[PDB]
Design a protein around this ligand. Sequence first.
Ligand code: NAG
Ligand code: NAG
Ligand code: NAG
Ligand code: NAG
Ligand code: NAG
Ligand code: NAG
Ligand code: NAG
Ligand code: NAG
Lengths: 99, 44, 262, 100, 99, 49, 22
Amino acid sequence: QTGNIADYNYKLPDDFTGCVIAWNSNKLDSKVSGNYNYLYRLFRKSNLKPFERDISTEIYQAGNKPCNGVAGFNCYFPLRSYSFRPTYGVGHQPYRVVV
Amino acid sequence: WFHVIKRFDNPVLPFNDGVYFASIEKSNIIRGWIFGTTLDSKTQ
Amino acid sequence: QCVNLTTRTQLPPAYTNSFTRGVYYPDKVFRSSVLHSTQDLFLPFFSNVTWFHVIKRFDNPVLPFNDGVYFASIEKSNIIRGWIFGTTLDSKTQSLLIVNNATNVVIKVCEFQFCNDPFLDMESEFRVYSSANNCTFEYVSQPFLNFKNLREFVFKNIDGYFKIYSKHTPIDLPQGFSALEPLVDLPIGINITRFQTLLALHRSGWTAGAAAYYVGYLQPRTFLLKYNENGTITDAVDCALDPLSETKCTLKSFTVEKGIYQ
Amino acid sequence: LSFELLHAPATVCGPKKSTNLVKNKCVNFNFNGLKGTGVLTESNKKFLPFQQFGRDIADTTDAVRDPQTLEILDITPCSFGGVSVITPGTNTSNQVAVLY
Amino acid sequence: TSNFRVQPTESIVRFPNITNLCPFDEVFNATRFASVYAWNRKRISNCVADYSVLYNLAPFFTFKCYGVSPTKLNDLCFTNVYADSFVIRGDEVRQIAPG
Amino acid sequence: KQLSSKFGAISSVLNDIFSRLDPPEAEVQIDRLITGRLQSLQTYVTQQL
Amino acid sequence: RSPIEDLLFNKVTKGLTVLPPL
Ligand SMILES: *[C@@H]1O[C@H](CO)[C@@H](O)[C@H](O)[C@H]1NC(C)=O
Ligand SMILES: *[C@@H]1O[C@H](CO)[C@@H](O)[C@H](O)[C@H]1NC(C)=O
Ligand SMILES: *[C@@H]1O[C@H](CO)[C@@H](O)[C@H](O)[C@H]1NC(C)=O
Ligand SMILES: *[C@@H]1O[C@H](CO)[C@@H](O)[C@H](O)[C@H]1NC(C)=O
Ligand SMILES: *[C@@H]1O[C@H](CO)[C@@H](O)[C@H](O)[C@H]1NC(C)=O
Ligand SMILES: *[C@@H]1O[C@H](CO)[C@@H](O)[C@H](O)[C@H]1NC(C)=O
Ligand SMILES: *[C@@H]1O[C@H](CO)[C@@H](O)[C@H](O)[C@H]1NC(C)=O
Ligand SMILES: *[C@@H]1O[C@H](CO)[C@@H](O)[C@H](O)[C@H]1NC(C)=O
């Protein structure tokens, strides 16, 4: 698969054997002001290998200017917060996925 | 080949693929190995 | 701006034959010294073709838009101007318009308002359509243009792509064979049901020179394509005309030996 | 600035057509969708302007023209073929020779 | 026993010669833009966007894109681009946000 | 000439199928293509024998 | 070659390869 998570967050190999288990967690895991405890990554230097967890907090660099650990010109924060709310649709509904 | 005697050969080499480690070891000198991308708190 | 004309004379259309005309390149694939067979729309060999004469003769009829069309014209002094394509020739549906004056060619598709007798008038008048509301595509290019010159045009509408193939061979339909190189491809993707033509009028009451054009319809029957050492088409053989050419199609050769064959 | 995600036939694609060209080497070219391996060699055969890519008796891309440049290049495969080994019996000796 | 074959090294064919099919300077280099309430609408279709001209100004402000990361704007293929240009004072530049 | 046969696939070319079709089924399509080519090769070998 | 064999020779005209005869 190809996507935001299927490329930079979690990959599944072609010979993977198992099951994918999902549930609606909008009753418990959602917050009226928004649940920012769960975060996702959008900026990576290369594609993430399957069954690999990335815990690097380094700022992604696009241009030749060094980010020096902070965002700025051609520098963006890889980590982004979720928008889990109970009053929104399926797209903002958190789902508990167990692999 | 690395020889330790007064020689202290502990270099850092990249891990591009799998490695084969052979040691003619006496009295249990070698204890273990350290593996990591950058060997710091920024990585695992 | 269109007005009624009552100077047209009533005459039945003429019919002639299409001995060795109506073969183009199936694709942009180059071939050298190989015998290749392809399945697409093509003009059948030795097939019927409709003939019209314009001299005082005025011939602007209404013809359908079958999957394959063939247009040939024995043209002198550039009397021809272009063609009209559409479904009902009004603003209720998209229509394709082709014009090519003395300096350039304009390819336009829009919901033009067409009258019952389109015409074009050196040239100092332009009375073809009336309105243009829903269209955003326009194209311009270099102009494509006793008898001395010939024109051969075919139009194909496959997968929403309109293909116009042109070839000029300066010298009834003359006896001979020639290639038909593709000219331009445009991704229009519209519904076309009835098509028309444009003829230029000379003012000196209007007088036009002697001209004639041929209109035909292609067929999806299987043919044979021969590629010489120069990559051009020299001879073609129908696979369903006579049994000898059917066996030529079966044996994949232009000659057959003495024997029994099914 | 706002866009639409898969609500209509696509019109504005980004430029993904490699960086440069390779001559006198068999590398995998991607000519607007078709993928093949061969050495780009100059051709003395005249090419009509409408033709884009050639075809051999094997129905494979052996000739092509540049999508922008008017120059024409022929696809010729580089060195390939089977290899055989000649040797005497193992009881006699172990010397071997290579043969293509 | 086997066959001999050399392997390819690089995969480069041509360069992005593709020219711009529609002007773009009318949305940011105009002499005067429309008002905040009567903001004009610009239609972009059947064209190609050259986003490599993004670096033109020294005081150029950061992207702060919402929903699309600027890293992957190139391999995307869109079908309709909307341009909405109107003037905002400098002390409510963060007002344009959901919620 | 039998190499340029569809053999029930979308196209006779392999790389466009690999880079366009979802691998899960693309594996089935390429398996059908290579087994059709194997059948043609086996027929050729039998005729040659 | 004798001319009879010469006349007989004159009257006769991607992984795959042709092995030359021994
Ligand atoms: C692993 O680390 C190397 C350098 O240490 C880096 O080049 C590579 O991209 C990393 N792998 C992933 C999946 O990020
Ligand atoms: C062509 O069609 C006309 C009527 O449409 C017919 O009179 C004529 O005999 C036909 N000619 C041939 C060669 O079929
Ligand atoms: C030919 O038609 C085009 C239509 O775009 C027009 O601009 C041009 O002036 C015309 N030329 C003449 C000589 O009428
Ligand atoms: C076509 O143009 C007319 C203008 O008279 C407009 O009313 C109509 O909505 C348009 N239709 C489309 C599909 O754009
Ligand atoms: C053309 O007409 C047919 C039948 O009326 C319809 O199915 C088709 O969608 C039309 N084409 C377009 C592009 O709308
Ligand atoms: C092919 O073209 C050459 C010119 O390079 C010409 O001399 C030759 O007669 C042509 N062959 C045919 C069959 O027309
Ligand atoms: C880009 O293409 C045009 C024609 O398509 C050509 O004239 C031009 O030379 C090309 N660019 C370069 C750098 O060669
Ligand atoms: C827009 O204006 C800037 C400065 O006024 C100039 O540098 C640039 O060339 C213009 N055009 C584009 C396409 O940015």
